[PDB]
């Protein structure tokens, strides 16, 4: 790890929007940064995130057809963009995994039903909006970890959702009935000082119940 200093990585994280157009990131490292991000938590461990990596001029051209122009600087200059979509059928993926173990004979049907019992009635019976809701949280927490991982690797990043929400999933070659678009994570070596920001005094946003 280029930067294992947690305070520095987290408390000095800003949205960098201008990257060195000459720096590329190998696909080995990109997949690795994604895996590291994916140590993130998720409800019932469904890990309902999906990454589409945009790291070539050709990919960027297609991708930009669903991105609003004010986010083109990040997109044009970034070494890679990792777009994060939410899999609203992730509970079936999870189920399929366990079903296979059972079919192999390495768990009984009883064990399989016990496993499925812990998540499947909940998710199988959930509304589309709740599914969308849960997948969005998963996408966001892993997105947050990816922002941090990028800096841990010596890079910088910008999360963005300034996009065409109805166009993005088909633009990525994904199944629009299944995946919900959440955010893009542009990653690169910083070529320009990020815009400074402030935060509210957290006391204005905090209540003690008793």
Q: Which residues contact 186 (CB under 8 A, 6 or more apart)?
A: 17, 19, 74, 75, 78, 80, 81, 157, 158, 160
Binding piece for ligand FMN, criterion CB under 6 A, among 1-9, 85-93, 159-167, 173-181: 159-167
Ramachandran region of residue 171, left (φ > 0), alpha (ψ -120 to 50) or beta?
alpha
DSSP 8-state code for residue 173 = T
Nearest of 75, 84, 69 to residue 182 by alpha carbon: 84
The tokens describing 55, both together, are: 């790291």
Helix/strand/coil for 89:
coil
Q: Which does 17 bind (CB under 5 to 8 A by kind): ligand FMN, a second copy, none?
A: ligand FMN
Q: What's the min distance (Å) between Cβ of 112 and ligand FMN? A: 18
Give the relative orientation of helices 109-117 and 90-104 as an angle to the nearest 10 degrees.
160
| Partner whose footprint covers residue 7, from ligand FMN, a second copy, none (CB < 5 to 8 Å by kind) | a second copy
Which residues share a beta bridge with 67? 163
Using alpha carbons, list the distances in angstroms from residue 5 to 1, 106, 153.
Answer: 10, 43, 11
The alpha-carbon radius of gyration of the chain (Å, integer) is: 19
The entry of ligand FMN, a second copy, none near residue 23 (CB within 5 to 8 angstroms by kind) is none
Place of tokens 């400074």: 196
**Least gap, CB of 52 to ligand FMN (angstroms):** 17
Supply the minimum distance, in Å, between the C-beta of residue 74 and ligand FMN.
7
Site residues for a second copy per CB under 8 A: 1, 3-7, 9-11, 13, 15, 27, 31, 34-36, 38-41, 43, 45, 47, 49-56, 58-59, 62-63, 87, 129, 133-134, 136-137, 140-141, 143-145, 147-149, 152, 159, 161, 172-174, 182-183, 197-200, 202-203, 205-210
Element housing 70 (H / E): none
Should residue 41 be labelled a site residue for ligand FMN when binding is judged by CB under 6 A?
yes
71 near ligand FMN, judged by CB under 6 A:
yes
What are the binding residues?
Answer: 13, 15, 17, 42, 71, 74, 161-162, 199
Using CB under 6 A, which of 50, 160, 168, 179 touches ligand FMN? 160
In the complex, which residues of this chain contact ligand FMN (CB under 6 A)? Answer: 14-15, 17, 41-45, 71, 137, 141, 158-162, 183, 194, 197
């Amino acid at each position: 790890l280029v930067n294992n200093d947690l305070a520095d990585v987290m408390f000095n994280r800003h949205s960098v929007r201008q990257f060195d157009p000459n720096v590329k990131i190998g696909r080995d490292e990109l997949q690795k940064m994604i895996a590291e991000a994916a140590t993130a938590p998720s409800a019932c461990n469904l890990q309902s995130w999906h990454f589409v990596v945009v790291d070539t001029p050709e990919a960027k051209a297609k991708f930009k057809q669903a991105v609003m122009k004010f986010n083109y600087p990040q997109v044009d200059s970034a070494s890679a963009i990792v777009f994060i979509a939410g899999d609203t059928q992730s509970h079936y993926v999870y189920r399929d995994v366990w079903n296979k173990v059972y079919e192999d004979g390495n768990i009984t049907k009883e064990r399989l039903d016990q496993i499925l019992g812990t998540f499947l009635p909940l998710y199988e019976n959930a509304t589309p909006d709740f599914l969308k809701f849960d997948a969005t949280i998963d996408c966001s927490v892993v997105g947050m970890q990816l922002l941090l991982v990028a800096r841990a690797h010596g890079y910088d990043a910008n999360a963005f959702s300034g996009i065409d929400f109805e166009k993005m999933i088909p633009t990525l070659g994904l199944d629009p009935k299944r995946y919900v678009p959440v955010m893009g994570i542009a990653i690169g070596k910083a070529a320009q000082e990020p815009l400074h920001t402030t935060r509210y005094d957290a006391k204005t946003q905090t209540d003690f119940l008793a």
